[PDB]
Design a protein around this ligand. Structure first.
Ligand code: JEF
Ligand code: JEF
Lengths: 21, 21, 21, 21, 21, 21, 21, 21, 21, 21, 21, 21
């Protein structure tokens, strides 16, 4: 599958996360 | 415009946000 | 099917609408 | 992550569900 | 238009459906 | 950014709007 | 709702169509 | 890459096409 | 939920996969 | 396939482009 | 919110930008 | 056009690919 990357800033901290589809 | 609603969740808490198109 | 929830806004007045799939 | 919501309907049975991204 | 396909499952009952755009 | 165009038909009027990404 | 416009060339002829969401 | 399938329909006929991401 | 159909391809070899919603 | 249209901007040198699906 | 990243090109003057959701 | 990036994990290997819109 494809893994997109986004900075999840919804949490207090910002963190790079993968988004797998 | 269209307004979609989503919970913006973090490491612990979440908040209702609008997503406008 | 899935029914997504959205608000159709315009002229400072919104209305709940469904979006079906 | 973001949590969207949808009404998942089958055979006259519907239940709100989350969809996490 | 384009016609996508999905398996719509409810309570152990699934049926292929079209989704037209 | 890409500027898509859509007709936003609210309640009192429609209007060609931009939607930039 | 929003009405997007696309040239539907899937048909032999190409034609502007609306896509309502 | 991911390959989605759709019927590319016209005024009369349709054809299976791939949509690659 | 909806189950979308896709092929995961790579190195000249694809495999059917589901994508659930 | 469907052909959407967008204004592709770059340092404010926008122009109409097609986006095929 | 989530922040995706893309290379926004214009006459081949690409640069990284954020795309917030 | 915007160039998004994703990790395309097939069967023999992953690889950072582009996906331009
Ligand atoms: C800003 O442009 C985003 C395009 O960049 C892509 C790299 C984004 O990648 C995707 C995987 C992540 O996109 C997010 C879902 C946010 O974008 C979508 C378009 C949100 O759009 C909203 C306005 C749509 O509102 C409702 C219909 C929510 O719809 C979501 C997308 C339904 O959930 C999806 C189908 C579940 O994800 C797929 C699963 C198999 N991983
Ligand atoms: C090229 O960028 C497209 C973004 O421009 C927008 C103006 C497009 O507008 C939308 C309304 C039309 O987009 C078409 C559906 C094609 O784009 C989508 C992203 C096709 O993507 C494929 C690869 C996804 O494959 C499966 C999951 C098919 O998913 C479709 C989108 C599911 O059907 C949708 C949710 C039904 O449409 C919504 C309905 C309420 N009108």
């Amino acid at each position: 599958a494809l893994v997109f990357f986004a900075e999840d800033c919804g949490s207090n901290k910002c963190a790079i996360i993968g988004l797998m589809v």
